mmCIF file of C-alpha atoms and ligand atoms in Angstrom:
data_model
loop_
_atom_site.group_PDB
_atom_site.id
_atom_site.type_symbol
_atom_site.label_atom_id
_atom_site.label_comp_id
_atom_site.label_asym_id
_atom_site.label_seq_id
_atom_site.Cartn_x
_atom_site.Cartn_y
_atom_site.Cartn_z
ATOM 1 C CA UNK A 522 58.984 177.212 -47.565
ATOM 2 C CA UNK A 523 59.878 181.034 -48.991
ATOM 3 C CA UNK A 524 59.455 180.733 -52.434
ATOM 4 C CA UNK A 525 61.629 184.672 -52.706
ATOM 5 C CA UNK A 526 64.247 186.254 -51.299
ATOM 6 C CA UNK A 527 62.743 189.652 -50.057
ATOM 7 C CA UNK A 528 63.806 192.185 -52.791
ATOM 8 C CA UNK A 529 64.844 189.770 -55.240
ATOM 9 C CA UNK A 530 64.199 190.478 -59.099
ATOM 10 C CA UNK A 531 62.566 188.456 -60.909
ATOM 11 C CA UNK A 532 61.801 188.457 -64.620
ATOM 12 C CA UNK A 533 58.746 187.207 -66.992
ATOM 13 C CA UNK A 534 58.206 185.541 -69.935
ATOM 14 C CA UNK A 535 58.342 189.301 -72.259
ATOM 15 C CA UNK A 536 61.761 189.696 -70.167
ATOM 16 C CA UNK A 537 60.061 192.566 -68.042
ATOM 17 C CA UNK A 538 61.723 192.924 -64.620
ATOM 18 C CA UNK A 539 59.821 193.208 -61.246
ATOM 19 C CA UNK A 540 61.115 193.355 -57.535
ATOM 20 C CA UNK A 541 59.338 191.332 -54.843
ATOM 21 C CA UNK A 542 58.056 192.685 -51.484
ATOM 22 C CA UNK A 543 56.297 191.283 -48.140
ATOM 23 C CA UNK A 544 53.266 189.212 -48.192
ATOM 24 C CA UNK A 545 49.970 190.463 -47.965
ATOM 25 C CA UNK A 546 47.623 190.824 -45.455
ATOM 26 C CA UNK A 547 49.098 189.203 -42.366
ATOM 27 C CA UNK A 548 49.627 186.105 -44.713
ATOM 28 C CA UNK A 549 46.249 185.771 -44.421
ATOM 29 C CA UNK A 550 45.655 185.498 -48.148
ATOM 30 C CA UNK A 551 48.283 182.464 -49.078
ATOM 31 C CA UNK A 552 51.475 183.448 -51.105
ATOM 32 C CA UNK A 553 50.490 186.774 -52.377
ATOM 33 C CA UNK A 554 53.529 189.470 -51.772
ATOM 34 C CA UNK A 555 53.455 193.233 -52.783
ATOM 35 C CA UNK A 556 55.456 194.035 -56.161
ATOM 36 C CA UNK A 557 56.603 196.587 -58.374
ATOM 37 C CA UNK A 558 58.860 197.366 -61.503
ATOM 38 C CA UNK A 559 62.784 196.874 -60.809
ATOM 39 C CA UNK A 560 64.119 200.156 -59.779
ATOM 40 C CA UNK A 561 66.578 200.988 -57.464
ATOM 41 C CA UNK A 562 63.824 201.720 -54.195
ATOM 42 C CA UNK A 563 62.494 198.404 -52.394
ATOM 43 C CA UNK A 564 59.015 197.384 -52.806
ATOM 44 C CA UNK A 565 56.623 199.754 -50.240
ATOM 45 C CA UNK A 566 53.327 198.892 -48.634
ATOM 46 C CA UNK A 567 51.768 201.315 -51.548
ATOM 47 C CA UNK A 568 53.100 198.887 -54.302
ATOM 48 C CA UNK A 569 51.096 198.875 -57.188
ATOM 49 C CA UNK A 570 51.242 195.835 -58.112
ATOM 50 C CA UNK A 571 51.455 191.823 -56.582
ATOM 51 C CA UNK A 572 52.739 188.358 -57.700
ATOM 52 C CA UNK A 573 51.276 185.091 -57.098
ATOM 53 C CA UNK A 574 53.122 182.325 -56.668
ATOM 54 C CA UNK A 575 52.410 178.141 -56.828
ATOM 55 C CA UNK A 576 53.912 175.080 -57.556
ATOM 56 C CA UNK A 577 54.150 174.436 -61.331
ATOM 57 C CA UNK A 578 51.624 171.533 -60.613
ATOM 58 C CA UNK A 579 49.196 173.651 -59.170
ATOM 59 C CA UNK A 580 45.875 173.779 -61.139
ATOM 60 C CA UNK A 581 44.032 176.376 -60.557
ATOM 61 C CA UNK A 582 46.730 179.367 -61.263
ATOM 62 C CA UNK A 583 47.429 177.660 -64.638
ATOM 63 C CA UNK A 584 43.477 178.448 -65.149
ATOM 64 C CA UNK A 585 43.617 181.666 -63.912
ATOM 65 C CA UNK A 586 46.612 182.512 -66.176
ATOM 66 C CA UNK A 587 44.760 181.224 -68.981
ATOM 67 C CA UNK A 588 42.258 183.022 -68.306
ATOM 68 C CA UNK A 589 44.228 186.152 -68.368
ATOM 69 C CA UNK A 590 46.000 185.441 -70.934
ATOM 70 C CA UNK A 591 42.746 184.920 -73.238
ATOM 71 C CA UNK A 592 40.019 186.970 -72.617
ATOM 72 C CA UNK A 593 42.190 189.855 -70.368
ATOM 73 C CA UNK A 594 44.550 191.814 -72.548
ATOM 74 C CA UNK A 595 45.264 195.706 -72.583
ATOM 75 C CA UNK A 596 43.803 195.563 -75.755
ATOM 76 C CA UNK A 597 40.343 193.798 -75.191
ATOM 77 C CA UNK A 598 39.593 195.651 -72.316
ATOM 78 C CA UNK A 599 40.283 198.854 -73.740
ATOM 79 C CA UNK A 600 38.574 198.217 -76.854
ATOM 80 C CA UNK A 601 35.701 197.355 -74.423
ATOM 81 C CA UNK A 602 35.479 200.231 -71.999
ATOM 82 C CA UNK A 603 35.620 202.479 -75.648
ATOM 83 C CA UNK A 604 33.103 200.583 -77.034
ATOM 84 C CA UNK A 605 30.460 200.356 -74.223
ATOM 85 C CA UNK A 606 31.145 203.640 -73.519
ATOM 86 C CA UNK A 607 32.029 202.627 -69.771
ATOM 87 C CA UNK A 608 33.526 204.545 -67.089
ATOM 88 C CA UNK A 609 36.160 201.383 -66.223
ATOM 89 C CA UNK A 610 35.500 197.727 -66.439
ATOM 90 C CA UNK A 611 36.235 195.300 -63.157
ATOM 91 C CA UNK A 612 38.630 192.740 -64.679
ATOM 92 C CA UNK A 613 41.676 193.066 -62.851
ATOM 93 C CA UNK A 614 44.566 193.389 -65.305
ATOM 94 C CA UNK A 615 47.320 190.779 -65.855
ATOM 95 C CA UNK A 616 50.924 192.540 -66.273
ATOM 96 C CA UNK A 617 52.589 189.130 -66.663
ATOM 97 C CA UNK A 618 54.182 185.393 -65.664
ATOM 98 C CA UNK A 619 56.589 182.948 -65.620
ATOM 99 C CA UNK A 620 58.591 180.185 -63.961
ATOM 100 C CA UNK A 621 60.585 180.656 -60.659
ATOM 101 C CA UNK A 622 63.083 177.965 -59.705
ATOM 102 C CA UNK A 623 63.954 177.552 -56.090
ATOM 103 C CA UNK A 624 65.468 174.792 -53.878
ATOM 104 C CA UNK A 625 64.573 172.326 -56.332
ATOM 105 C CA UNK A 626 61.238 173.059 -56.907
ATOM 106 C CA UNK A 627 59.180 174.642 -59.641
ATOM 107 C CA UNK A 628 56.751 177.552 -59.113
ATOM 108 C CA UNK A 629 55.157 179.437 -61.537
ATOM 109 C CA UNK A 630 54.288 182.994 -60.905
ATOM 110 C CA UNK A 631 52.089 185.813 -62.561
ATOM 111 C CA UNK A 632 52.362 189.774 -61.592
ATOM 112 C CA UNK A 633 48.303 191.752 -61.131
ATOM 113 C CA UNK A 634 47.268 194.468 -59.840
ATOM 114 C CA UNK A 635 47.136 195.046 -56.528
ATOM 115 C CA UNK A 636 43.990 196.157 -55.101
ATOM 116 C CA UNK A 637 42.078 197.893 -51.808
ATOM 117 C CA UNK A 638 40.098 196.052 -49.456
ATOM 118 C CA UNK A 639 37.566 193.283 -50.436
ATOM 119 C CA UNK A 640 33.621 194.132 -49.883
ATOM 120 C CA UNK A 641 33.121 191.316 -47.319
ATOM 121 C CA UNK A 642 35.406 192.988 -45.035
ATOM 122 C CA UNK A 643 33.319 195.832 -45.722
ATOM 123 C CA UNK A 644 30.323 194.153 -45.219
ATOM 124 C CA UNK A 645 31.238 192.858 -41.865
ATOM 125 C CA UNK A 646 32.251 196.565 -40.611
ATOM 126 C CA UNK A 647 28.617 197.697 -41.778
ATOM 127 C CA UNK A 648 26.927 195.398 -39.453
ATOM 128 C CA UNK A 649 26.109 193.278 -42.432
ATOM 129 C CA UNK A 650 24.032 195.518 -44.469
ATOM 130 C CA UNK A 651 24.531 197.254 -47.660
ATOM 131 C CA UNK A 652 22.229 200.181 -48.801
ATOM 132 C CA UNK A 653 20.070 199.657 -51.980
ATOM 133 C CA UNK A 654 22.019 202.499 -53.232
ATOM 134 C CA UNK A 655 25.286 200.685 -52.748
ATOM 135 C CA UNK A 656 23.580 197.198 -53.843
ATOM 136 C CA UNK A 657 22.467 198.336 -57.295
ATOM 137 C CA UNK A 658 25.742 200.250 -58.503
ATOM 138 C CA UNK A 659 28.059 197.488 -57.151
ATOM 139 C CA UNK A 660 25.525 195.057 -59.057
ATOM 140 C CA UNK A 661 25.071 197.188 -62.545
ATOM 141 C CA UNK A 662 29.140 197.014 -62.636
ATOM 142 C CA UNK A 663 29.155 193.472 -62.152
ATOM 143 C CA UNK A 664 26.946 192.880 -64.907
ATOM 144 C CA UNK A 665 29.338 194.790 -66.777
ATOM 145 C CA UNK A 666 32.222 192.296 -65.848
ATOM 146 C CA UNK A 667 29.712 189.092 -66.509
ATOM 147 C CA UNK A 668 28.854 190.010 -69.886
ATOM 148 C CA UNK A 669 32.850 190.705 -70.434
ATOM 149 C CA UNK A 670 33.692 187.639 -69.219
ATOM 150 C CA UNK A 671 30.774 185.547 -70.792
ATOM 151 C CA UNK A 672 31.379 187.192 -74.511
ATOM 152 C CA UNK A 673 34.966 185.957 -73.882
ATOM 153 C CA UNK A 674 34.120 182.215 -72.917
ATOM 154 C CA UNK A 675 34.121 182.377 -69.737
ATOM 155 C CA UNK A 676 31.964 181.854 -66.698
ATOM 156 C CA UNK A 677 33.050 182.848 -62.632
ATOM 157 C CA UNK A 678 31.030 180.565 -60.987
ATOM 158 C CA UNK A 679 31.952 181.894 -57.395
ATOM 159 C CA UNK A 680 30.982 185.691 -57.308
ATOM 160 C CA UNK A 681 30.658 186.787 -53.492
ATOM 161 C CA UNK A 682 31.740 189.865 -51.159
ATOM 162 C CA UNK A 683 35.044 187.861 -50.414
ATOM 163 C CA UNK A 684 36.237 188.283 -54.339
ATOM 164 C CA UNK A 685 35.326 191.687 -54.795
ATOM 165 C CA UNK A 686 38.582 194.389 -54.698
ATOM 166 C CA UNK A 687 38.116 197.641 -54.757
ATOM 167 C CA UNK A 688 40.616 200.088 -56.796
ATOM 168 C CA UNK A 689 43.230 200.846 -54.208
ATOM 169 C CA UNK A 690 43.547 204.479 -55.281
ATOM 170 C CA UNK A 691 39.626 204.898 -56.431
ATOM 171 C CA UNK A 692 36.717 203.333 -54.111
ATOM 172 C CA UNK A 693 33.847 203.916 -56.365
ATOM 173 C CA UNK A 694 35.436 200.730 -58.807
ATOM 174 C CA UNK A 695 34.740 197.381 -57.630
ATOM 175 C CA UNK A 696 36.987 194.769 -59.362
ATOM 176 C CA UNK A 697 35.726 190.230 -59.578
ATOM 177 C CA UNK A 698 39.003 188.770 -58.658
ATOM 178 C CA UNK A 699 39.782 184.941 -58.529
ATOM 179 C CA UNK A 700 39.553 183.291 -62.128
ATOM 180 C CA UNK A 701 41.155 179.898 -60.570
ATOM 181 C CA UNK A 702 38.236 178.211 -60.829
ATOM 182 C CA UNK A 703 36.891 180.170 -63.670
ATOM 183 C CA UNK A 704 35.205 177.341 -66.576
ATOM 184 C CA UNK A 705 35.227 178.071 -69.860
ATOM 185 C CA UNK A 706 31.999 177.746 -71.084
ATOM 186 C CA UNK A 707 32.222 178.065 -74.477
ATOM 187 C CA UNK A 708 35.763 177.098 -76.110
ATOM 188 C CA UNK A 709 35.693 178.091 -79.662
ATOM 189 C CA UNK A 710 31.997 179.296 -79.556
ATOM 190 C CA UNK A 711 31.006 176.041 -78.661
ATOM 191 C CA UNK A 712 28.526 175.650 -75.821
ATOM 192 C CA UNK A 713 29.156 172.842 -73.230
ATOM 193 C CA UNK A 714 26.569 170.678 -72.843
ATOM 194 C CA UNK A 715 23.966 170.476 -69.603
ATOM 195 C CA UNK A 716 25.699 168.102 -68.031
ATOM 196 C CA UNK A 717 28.720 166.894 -65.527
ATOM 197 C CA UNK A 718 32.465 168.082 -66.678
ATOM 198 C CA UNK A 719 34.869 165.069 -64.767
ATOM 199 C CA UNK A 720 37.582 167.643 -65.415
ATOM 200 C CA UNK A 721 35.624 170.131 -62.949
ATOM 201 C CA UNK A 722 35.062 169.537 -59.071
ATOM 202 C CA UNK A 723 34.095 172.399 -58.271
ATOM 203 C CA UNK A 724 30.585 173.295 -57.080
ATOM 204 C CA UNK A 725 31.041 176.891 -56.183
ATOM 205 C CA UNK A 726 30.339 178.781 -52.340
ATOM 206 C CA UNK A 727 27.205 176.492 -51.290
ATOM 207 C CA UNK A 728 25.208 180.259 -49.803
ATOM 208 C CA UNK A 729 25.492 181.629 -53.365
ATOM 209 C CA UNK A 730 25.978 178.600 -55.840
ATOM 210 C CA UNK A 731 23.293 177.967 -58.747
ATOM 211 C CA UNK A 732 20.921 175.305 -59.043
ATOM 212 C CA UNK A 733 22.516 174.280 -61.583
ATOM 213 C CA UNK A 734 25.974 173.557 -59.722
ATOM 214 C CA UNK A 735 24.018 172.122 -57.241
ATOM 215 C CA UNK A 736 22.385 169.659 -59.515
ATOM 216 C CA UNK A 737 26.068 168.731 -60.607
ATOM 217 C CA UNK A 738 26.403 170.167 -64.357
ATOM 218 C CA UNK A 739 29.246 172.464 -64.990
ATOM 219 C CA UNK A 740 28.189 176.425 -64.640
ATOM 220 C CA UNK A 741 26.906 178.558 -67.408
ATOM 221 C CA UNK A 742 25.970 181.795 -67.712
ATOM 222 C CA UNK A 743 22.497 181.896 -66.466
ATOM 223 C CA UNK A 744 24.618 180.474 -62.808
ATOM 224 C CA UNK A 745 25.947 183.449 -62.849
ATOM 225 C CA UNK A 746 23.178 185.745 -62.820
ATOM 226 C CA UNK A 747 21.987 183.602 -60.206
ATOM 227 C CA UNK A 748 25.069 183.565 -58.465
ATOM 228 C CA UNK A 749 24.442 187.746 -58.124
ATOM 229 C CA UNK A 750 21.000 187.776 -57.417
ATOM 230 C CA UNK A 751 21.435 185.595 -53.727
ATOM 231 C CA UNK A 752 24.448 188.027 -53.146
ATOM 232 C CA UNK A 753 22.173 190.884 -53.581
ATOM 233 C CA UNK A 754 19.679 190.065 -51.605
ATOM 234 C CA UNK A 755 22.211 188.570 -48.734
ATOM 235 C CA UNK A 756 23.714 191.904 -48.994
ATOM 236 C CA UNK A 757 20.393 194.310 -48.690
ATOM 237 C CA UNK A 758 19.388 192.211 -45.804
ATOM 238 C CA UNK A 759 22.195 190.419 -43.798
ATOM 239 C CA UNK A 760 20.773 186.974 -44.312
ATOM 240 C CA UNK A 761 19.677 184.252 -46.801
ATOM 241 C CA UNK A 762 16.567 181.531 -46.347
ATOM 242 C CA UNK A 763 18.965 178.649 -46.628
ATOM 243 C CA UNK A 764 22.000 179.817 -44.050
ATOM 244 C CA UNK A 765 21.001 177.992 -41.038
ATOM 245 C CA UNK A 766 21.816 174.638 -43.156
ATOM 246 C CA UNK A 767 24.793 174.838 -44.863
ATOM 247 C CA UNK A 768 26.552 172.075 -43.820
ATOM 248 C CA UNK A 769 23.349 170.135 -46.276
ATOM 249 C CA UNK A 770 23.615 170.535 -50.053
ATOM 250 C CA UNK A 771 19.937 168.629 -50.331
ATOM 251 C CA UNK A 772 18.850 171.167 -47.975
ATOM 252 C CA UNK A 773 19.984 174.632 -49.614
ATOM 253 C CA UNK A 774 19.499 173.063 -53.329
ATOM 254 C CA UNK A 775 15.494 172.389 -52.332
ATOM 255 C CA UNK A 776 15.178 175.452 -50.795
ATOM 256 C CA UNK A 777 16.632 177.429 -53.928
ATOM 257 C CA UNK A 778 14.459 175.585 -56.072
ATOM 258 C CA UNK A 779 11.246 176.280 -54.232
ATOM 259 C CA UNK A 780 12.199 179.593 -53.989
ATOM 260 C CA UNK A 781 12.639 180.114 -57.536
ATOM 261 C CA UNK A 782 10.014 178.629 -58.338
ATOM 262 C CA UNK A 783 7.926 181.005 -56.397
ATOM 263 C CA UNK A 784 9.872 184.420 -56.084
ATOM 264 C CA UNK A 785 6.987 186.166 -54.445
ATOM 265 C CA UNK A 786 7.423 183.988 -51.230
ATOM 266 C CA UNK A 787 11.335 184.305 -51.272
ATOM 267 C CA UNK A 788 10.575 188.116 -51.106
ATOM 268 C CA UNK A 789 8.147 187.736 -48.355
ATOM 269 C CA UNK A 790 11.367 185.747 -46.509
ATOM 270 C CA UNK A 791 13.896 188.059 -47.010
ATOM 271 C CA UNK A 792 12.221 191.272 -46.982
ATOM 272 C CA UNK A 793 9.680 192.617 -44.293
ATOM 273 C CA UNK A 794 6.031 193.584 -44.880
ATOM 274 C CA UNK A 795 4.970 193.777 -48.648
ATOM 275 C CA UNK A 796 8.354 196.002 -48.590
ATOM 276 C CA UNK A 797 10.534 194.394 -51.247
ATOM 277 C CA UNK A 798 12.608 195.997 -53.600
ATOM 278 C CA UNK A 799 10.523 195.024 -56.468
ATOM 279 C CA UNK A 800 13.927 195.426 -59.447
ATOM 280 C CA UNK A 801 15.322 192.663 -57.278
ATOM 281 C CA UNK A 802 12.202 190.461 -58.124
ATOM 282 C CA UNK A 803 11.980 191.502 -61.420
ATOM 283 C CA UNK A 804 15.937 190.843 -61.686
ATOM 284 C CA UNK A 805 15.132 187.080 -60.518
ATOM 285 C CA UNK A 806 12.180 186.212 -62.830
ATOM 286 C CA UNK A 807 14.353 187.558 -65.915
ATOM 287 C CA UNK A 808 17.128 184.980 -64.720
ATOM 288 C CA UNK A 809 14.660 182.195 -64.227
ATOM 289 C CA UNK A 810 13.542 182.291 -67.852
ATOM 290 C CA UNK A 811 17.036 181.631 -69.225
ATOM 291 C CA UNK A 812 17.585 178.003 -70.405
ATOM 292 C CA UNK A 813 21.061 176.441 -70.129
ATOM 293 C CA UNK A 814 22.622 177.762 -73.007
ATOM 294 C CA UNK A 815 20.904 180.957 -73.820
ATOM 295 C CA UNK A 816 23.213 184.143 -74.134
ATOM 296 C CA UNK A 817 21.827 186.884 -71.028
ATOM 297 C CA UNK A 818 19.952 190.088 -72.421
ATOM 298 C CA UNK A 819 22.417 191.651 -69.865
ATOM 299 C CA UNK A 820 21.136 195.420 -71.060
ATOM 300 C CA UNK A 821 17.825 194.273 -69.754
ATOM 301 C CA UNK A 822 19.051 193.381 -66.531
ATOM 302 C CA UNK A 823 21.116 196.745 -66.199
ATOM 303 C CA UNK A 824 17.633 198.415 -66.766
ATOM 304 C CA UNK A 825 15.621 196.771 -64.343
ATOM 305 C CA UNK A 826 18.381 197.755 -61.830
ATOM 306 C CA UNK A 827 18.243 201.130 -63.055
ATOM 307 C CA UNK A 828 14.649 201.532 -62.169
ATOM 308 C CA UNK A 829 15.635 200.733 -58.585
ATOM 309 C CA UNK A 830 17.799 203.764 -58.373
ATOM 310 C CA UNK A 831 14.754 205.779 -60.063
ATOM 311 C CA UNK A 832 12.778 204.743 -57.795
ATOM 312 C CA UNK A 833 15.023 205.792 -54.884
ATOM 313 C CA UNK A 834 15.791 208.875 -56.237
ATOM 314 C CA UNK A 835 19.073 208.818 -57.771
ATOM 315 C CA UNK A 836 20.705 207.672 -60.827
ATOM 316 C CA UNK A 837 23.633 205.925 -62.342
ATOM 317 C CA UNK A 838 26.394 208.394 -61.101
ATOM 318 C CA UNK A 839 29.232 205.233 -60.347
ATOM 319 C CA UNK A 840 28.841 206.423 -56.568
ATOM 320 C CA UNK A 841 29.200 202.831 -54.967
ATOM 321 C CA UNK A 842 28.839 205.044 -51.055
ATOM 322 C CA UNK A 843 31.040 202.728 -49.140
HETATM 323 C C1 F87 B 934 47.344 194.701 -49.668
HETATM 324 C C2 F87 B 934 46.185 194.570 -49.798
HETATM 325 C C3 F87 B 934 44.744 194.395 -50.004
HETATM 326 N N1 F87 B 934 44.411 193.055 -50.485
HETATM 327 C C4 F87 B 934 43.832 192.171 -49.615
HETATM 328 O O1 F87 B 934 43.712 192.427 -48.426
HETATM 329 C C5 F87 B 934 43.304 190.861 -50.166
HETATM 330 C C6 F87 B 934 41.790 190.811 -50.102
HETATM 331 N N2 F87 B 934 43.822 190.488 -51.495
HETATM 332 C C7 F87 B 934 43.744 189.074 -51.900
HETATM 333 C C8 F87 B 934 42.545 188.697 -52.753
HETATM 334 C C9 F87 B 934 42.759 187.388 -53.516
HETATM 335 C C10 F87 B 934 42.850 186.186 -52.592
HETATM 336 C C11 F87 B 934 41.712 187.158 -54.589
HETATM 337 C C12 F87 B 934 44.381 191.437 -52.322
HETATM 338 N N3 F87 B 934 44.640 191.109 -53.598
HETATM 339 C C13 F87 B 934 45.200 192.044 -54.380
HETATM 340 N N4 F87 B 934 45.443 191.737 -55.674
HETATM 341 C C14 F87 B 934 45.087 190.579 -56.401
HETATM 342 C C15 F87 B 934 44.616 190.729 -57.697
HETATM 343 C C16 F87 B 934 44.256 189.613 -58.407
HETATM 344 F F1 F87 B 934 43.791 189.758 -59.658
HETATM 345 C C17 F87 B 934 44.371 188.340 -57.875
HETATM 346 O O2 F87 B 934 44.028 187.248 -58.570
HETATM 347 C C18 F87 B 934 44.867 188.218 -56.592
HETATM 348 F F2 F87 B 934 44.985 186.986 -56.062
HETATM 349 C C19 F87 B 934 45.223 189.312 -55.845
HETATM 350 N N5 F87 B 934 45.504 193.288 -53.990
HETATM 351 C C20 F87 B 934 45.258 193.618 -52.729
HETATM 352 C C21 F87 B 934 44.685 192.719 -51.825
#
């Protein structure tokens, strides 16, 4: 069912205008299509910019633009990035939304940046390997976008190769994309409790999830950092203990747990020899200490990744070497 006319003009809620293009990536990616300001010229296959469109009764892009809407404004971003003194921050920006009418139905839509490729397809054309080099700046700059995201109530609960963009003009800047089911943590400065949210069903990517998904309470922060440390080490290495078994939730959750519980023999797992990286252990024994609702010492983190690039010989230059 097309929800647009090709090249129609549609406007948002602030009355900007925008022209729709074709969809995205074979269709591949749902009802995504290519967009740009109204002008004159039809929308290219360099557009700038794409809209998302759902049913009005669709869930998860009311959370998303919620999410947006609250913790993802020109404003708070920039204020960050000055701030922080970052090069760029990975939150992709929202240019707007509204309601779209068609054949009787009601969709809602909301206009984002369009990006570059994601890092799984990446991945894949590696032969399933990233370098450390690669694995510690695309990590440092998602710790950047955690701690954004966490100081603004808000946990991911889903990070993976699959929902990171890069910059479609810049491939050094690695953007977390999919907010739809994104849980807010911390309404009001208010921590939600260790335990079940009926008003949340999801659990996550089983590979990557935390323990604490697994064990059925609604994410937090410390999931997060979790989340990042099985990417990383499925990313250096092309594997995880627990992939073989993924079709049993018991099975991955008691592995994780045994394996956090002793990090040194989830090293000797994943890596060869005694030739871990050790920041990656060090990175996994800092997230273990973290109790349910304890706010990250994210700088901390960011430094025991930058002693991995020491110890490599190179530094934080943004170079993700894609
Ligand atoms: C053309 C092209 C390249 N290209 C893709 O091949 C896939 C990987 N996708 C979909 C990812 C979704 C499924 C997460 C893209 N998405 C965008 N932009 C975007 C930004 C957001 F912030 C969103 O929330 C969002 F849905 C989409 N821009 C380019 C892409």
């Amino acid at each position: 069912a097309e929800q647009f006319a090709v090249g129609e003009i549609i406007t948002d809620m602030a009355a900007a205008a925008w022209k729709v293009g074709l969809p995205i990536g074979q269709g591949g990616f749902g009802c995504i299509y290519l967009a740009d300001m109204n002008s004159s010229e039809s929308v290219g296959s360099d557009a700038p910019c794409v809209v998302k469109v759902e049913p009005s009764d669709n869930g998860p892009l009311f959370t998303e633009l919620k999410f947006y809407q609250r913790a993802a404004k020109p404003e708070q971003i920039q204020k960050w990035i000055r701030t922080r003194k970052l090069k760029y921050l990975g939150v992709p920006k929202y240019w707007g939304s509204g309601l779209h009418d068609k054949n009787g139905k009601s969709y809602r839509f909301m206009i984002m940046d369009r990006f570059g490729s994601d890092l799984q397809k990446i991945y894949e054309a590696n032969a399933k390997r990233f370098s450390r080099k690669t694995v510690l700046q695309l990590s440092l700059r998602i710790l950047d976008i955690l701690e954004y995201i966490h100081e603004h109530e808000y946990v991911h609960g889903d990070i993976k190769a699959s929902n990171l963009l890069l910059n479609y003009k810049n491939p050094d800047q690695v953007y977390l994309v999919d907010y739809g089911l994104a849980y807010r943590y911390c309404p009001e400065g208010v921590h939600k409790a260790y335990a079940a949210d009926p008003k949340r069903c999801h659990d996550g990517t089983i590979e990557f999830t935390s323990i604490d998904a697994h064990n059925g309470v609604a994410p937090s922060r410390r999931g997060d950092l979790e989340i990042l440390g099985y990417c990383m080490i499925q990313w250096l290495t092309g594997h995880l203990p627990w992939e073989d078994n993924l079709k049993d939730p018991k099975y991955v959750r008691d592995s994780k747990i045994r394996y956090r519980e002793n990090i040194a023999s989830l090293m000797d797992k994943c890596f060869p020899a005694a030739n871990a990286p050790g920041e990656i252990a060090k990175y996994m024994e800092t997230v273990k200490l973290l109790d349910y609702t304890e706010k990250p010492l994210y700088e901390n983190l960011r430094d025991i990744l930058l002693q991995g690039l020491k110890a490599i010989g190179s530094k934080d230059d943004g170079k993700l070497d894609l």
